[PDB]
């Protein structure tokens, strides 16, 4: 069966079918960049929902609960899915992109995409098409969102990405398997280890991205894992400057070295009321990977 | 009144014990079938209770009964089938790995977790569930099919 | 080296010396007896530090950084150290007493005295002579009070002795020996498990007192030869444990059914709670969780 | 300086360190040895460090050392030892469990004992102490002498 976690499964040039799918949110988007921030191509993420997968929280998971989809060319999705301020605002065609994934369902067309992470190539979901389907029954996402907009959004921003970022406290971490980390799929609150190969970190303006392997990368679920790092004092605790600077090649001086990080949950806001868990490193700054690097 | 239908009748009081309080007295159970003595009976229910621990599922005293793996377990089974009965999904397949892994009960057997759903799709009154059907398809997945009367 | 826990290197009819020590506090006293429970011999404790002995906290753990020792005549003892009182005022007595041990160190006496539980024989330490005495430089143990007094004691209280019982959710906890408890030295908050005979089980008026020993010697006719280390006395105390524990508001029972579960090997437990002996001083001590009489009695006549 | 002494040195910086906080930057003890950006020795420091980590005195990330372990541990010679000094005691045998038992380090070795002991009797300005010696008595136990220029 088509599942998030099935890539490694899936087979090249072979359509894929969601039928009934929920579009839960975007990356990027109003709420992570403000800003009229230039969308380039691949670069555009949605996250996607069907009703046979679990449904835990407001905070979703990638490759367990739901899909993490990559768009290829915006101009062609923004089009058939009904956006009609592009390329002009990027700031209305959002709001208008969240009006149509608020409001409607949509059956969709994935394939198994070949990219590469610096010198590795590896596998990710990307859109083909995506057509409105007819309304009609009840729908847990727009329930789940109704109790979030009585209750306490304050608890899910207590793990917001940007809130700078402390140890838990934890008593002797234990060093723990990718799998298990994409396993990990509640808000645990407590720190948990890992020794993974650097792939490549690459620096997106607010927030910087680690891709981390334990092993082409034939199954990404199991040996790749996607580690963020946001917020000024974050960013400003990783680079030693608050002007996020330096050198070109000193992300490229990183690629390949075997590093033990500590990691603690985190949470993406990808819609008004709908968020995705990611992981952050503690305490890691480009200086002690530079200086572990020249080792 | 079969000893494989005395332990359904255990475990499902053990589970409606496990959602008010995560303790209960060792006995307590074996209390409540026979009024809603034999030495060579009793030790045929703490043989029982020590395949569920074997599994993790309960710990014990001499005195009490932990469920609390057991809460969190059951838990997770109505989290999961509640979802799918207010969508009316007509059937879903599931791997046994899914609820050994979401409670990090990894010894927990394929019979266990069926009589636990099992046990939920009986119990459950919320939504239009009136028949379901679970197949023991594989070593890794089940089948579980459900049924509903309203639209 | 005369310490805490080398009673078993003791030998019979020696006195042994304690120089300089802080008599920390007592058993019975006005925190765990309100009214004045008639002291009787041999049921009089105190408590000893003395400033070779390692100070963690307010809380204190005998056989490790305290004595515990019995005192076999009251109305000497309290003569000798300077009680005046004794006997026209029991809680008066107490008064003094609390006076003398909180103000003046002293110079104790003791010796190895044996003592039956049930039908094993063990020993415990008994004082024999006190002599008073008095130095500059400052009490660690008063520094440890005064600190105690500023920001109180509500996080040691919460491990009374008397609050209800109820597991601390510890995520699958380890059983262990009956060693290891006693080298068990920190208010963990933690529950322990450990398999383990009964050797005895007293009512002692306001708390139930259950000796436990390895489970594998024979009977119970024998001698104990190292207490510290063979010995676990885990105890209940207060109306809602107590009531729980014999399944009465009145303590009710009938004699032949205590000694009936001697012998009998359960599976307990424990949590750590902490008796008070003084104004701001405690002992560590072990409590069973969920224990009662009718499911030993029961578990018993199985076995 | 030396083999030995870059290991006493870099070990004696992570006890106090341990005293001010519980945590730190891994190479913060490396560079408050070197001038209180090239070297090239890190192999023999991270060396270190690693072997202190597999009896957990210490735990180690790629940026943090966590000394929570060791601030407990060395908390505990600080009590028990400064408290012989206090009574000028002459000598003690002290079974390494004792140390071991206290901070839940199963893996602590005789070598780190003594060297965080030897430490604290090396640093200790409280008390009339003056000259010390330990003998390791047996593979159990290690027998501390003091000395004292006054009584």
């Known amino acids: 069966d088509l599942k998030p976690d099935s890539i490694s499964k899936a087979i090249t040039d072979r359509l894929y079918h969601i039928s009934d799918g929920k579009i839960l949110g975007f990356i990027p988007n109003?709420?992570?960049?403000?800003?009229?921030?230039?969308?380039?191509?691949?670069?555009?993420?949605?996250?996607?929902?069907?009703?046979?997968?679990?449904?835990?929280?407001?905070?979703?998971?990638?490759?367990?609960?739901?899909?993490?989809?990559?768009?290829?060319?915006?101009?062609?999705?923004?089009?058939?899915?009904?956006?009609?301020?592009?390329?002009?605002?990027?700031?209305?065609?959002?709001?208008e992109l969240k009006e149509l994934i608020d409001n409607n369902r949509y059956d969709i067309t994935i394939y198994k995409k070949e990219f590469t992470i610096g010198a590795a190539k590896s596998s990710k979901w990307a859109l083909k098409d995506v057509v409105l389907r007819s309304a009609s029954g009840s729908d847990s996402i727009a329930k789940l969102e109704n109790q979030l907009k009585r209750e306490g959004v304050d608890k899910i921003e207590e793990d917001a990405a940007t809130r700078p970022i402390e140890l838990f406290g934890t008593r002797n971490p234990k060093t723990v398997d990718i799998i298990d980390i994409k396993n990990n799929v509640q808000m645990d609150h407590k720190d948990i280890?890992?020794?993974?190969?650097?792939?490549?970190?690459?620096?997106?303006?607010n927030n910087v991205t680690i891709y981390l392997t334990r092993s082409t990368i034939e199954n990404p679920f199991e040996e790749l894992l996607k580690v963020q790092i946001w917020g000024r004092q974050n960013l400003t605790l990783?680079?030693?400057?608050?002007?996020?600077?330096?050198?070109?090649?000193?992300?490229?001086?990183?690629?390949?070295?075997?590093?033990?990080?500590?990691?603690?949950?985190?949470?993406?806001?990808?819609?008004?009321?709908?968020?995705?868990?990611?992981?952050?490193?503690?305490?890691?700054?480009?200086?002690?990977?530079?200086?572990?690097?020249?080792? | 009144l079969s000893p494989k239908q005395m332990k359904r009748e255990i475990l499902g009081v053990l589970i409606?014990?496990?959602?008010?309080?995560?303790?209960?007295?060792?006995?307590?159970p074996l209390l409540s079938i026979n009024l809603g003595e034999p030495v060579l009976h009793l030790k045929f229910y703490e043989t029982f209770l020590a395949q569920l621990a074997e599994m993790?599922?309960?710990?014990?005293?001499?005195?009490?009964?932990?469920?609390?793996?057991?809460?969190?377990?059951?838990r997770y089974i109505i989290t999961r089938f509640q979802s799918l009965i207010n969508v009316q999904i007509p059937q879903i397949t599931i791997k046994y790995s899914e609820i050994r892994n979401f409670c990090k009960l990894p010894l927990l057997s394929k019979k266990l977790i069926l009589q636990m759903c099992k046990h939920f799709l009986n119990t459950t009154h919320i939504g239009n569930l009136?028949?379901?059907?679970?197949?023991?398809?594989?070593?890794?997945?089940?089948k579980v099919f459900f049924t509903y009367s309203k639209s």
């Not at chain 1, 905070?59 to 990559?70: D, K």
């Not at chain 1, 990783?238 to 090649?249: A, D, I, L, V």
């Open chain 1, 193 to 205: 280890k890992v020794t993974a190969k650097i792939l490549s970190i690459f620096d997106n303006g």
């Open chain 1, 30 to 95: 109003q709420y992570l960049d403000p800003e009229s921030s230039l969308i380039e191509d691949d670069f555009l993420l949605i996250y996607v929902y069907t009703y046979e997968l679990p449904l835990l929280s407001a905070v979703f998971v990638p490759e367990y609960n739901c899909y993490e989809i990559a768009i290829t060319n915006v101009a062609k999705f923004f089009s058939k899915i009904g956006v009609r301020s592009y390329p002009h605002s990027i700031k209305n065609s959002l709001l």
């Open chain 2, 56 to 74: 993790a599922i309960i710990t014990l005293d001499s005195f009490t009964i932990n469920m609390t793996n057991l809460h969190n377990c059951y």
């Open chain 2, 130 to 142: 009136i028949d379901w059907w679970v197949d023991p398809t594989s070593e890794e997945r089940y």
């Open chain 2, 16 to 28: 409606e014990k496990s959602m008010e309080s995560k303790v209960c007295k060792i006995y307590e």
């Open chain 1, 238 to 295: 990783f680079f030693g400057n608050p002007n996020y600077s330096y050198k070109r090649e000193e992300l490229t001086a990183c690629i390949g070295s075997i590093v033990d990080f500590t990691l603690i949950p985190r949470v993406l806001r990808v819609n008004e009321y709908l968020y995705i868990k990611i992981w952050c490193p503690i305490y890691a700054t480009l200086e002690s990977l530079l200086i572990h690097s020249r080792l």
